[PDB]
Every structure is written in structure tokens, then in C-alpha cells.
């Protein structure tokens, strides 16, 4: 293993460097519709009945193999 150590100081008080986003190269996240579920967020809570709770979970709440748009954006309500 070859090691090497360096030192840096900023001389002047006021800011001496500025960046700026100039060109949008790509849009990673798709702006579409992907609701974030709670049943993966809050697994511990449940209703009174097992029947009503199972019915609710099966009707609505229910790894994606493939995606054409990109990293999906979680929409929260």
C-alpha cells in the first residue's frame, strides 16, 4: 500500500469558487404515478378482525422485473 498525505488552506476570507448547473444531461427519476404503500412501512398495525383486514389487504394493498421509465418516484399523500 502506497500512502500520500496532503494539506490545504483557503487564503482569503470571502468565497473564491462557485459552481452552476448549466446543462440538463438526463432525467433519472420518472415523474409518473407510483403510490408508496403503508403496509410495507407499517407492518405491525392491524384492524380488529382478521377477516376485514385480510379483505382490505387483498383488495388494495396486495421486486419489479423490468422498468421502462427509470427510478420510480414515491408519491406520498
Amino acid at each position: 500500500e502506497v500512502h500520500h498525505e496532503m494539506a490545504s488552506i483557503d487564503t482569503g476570507l470571502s468565497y473564491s469558487s462557485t459552481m452552476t448547473p448549466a446543462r440538463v444531461a438526463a432525467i433519472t427519476t420518472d415523474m409518473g404515478i407510483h403510490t408508496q404503500d403503508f403496509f410495507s412501512v407499517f407492518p405491525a398495525e392491524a384492524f380488529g378482525n382478521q377477516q376485514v383486514n385480510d379483505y382490505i389487504k387483498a383488495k388494495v394493498g396486495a421486486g419489479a422485473p423490468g422498468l421502462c421509465h427509470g427510478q420510480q418516484a414515491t408519491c406520498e399523500i
Binding site: 433519472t28 427519476t29 421486486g63 419489479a64 422498468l67 427510478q71 420510480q72 418516484a73 414515491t74
Partner: peptide
Amino acid sequence: PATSNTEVQ
């Protein structure tokens, strides 16, 4: 902040 280049963010 959320992560990049992953499916579920």
C-alpha cells in the same frame, strides 16, 4: 436524501 440508480428509491 434518497438514493440514485435503484428501483424503489
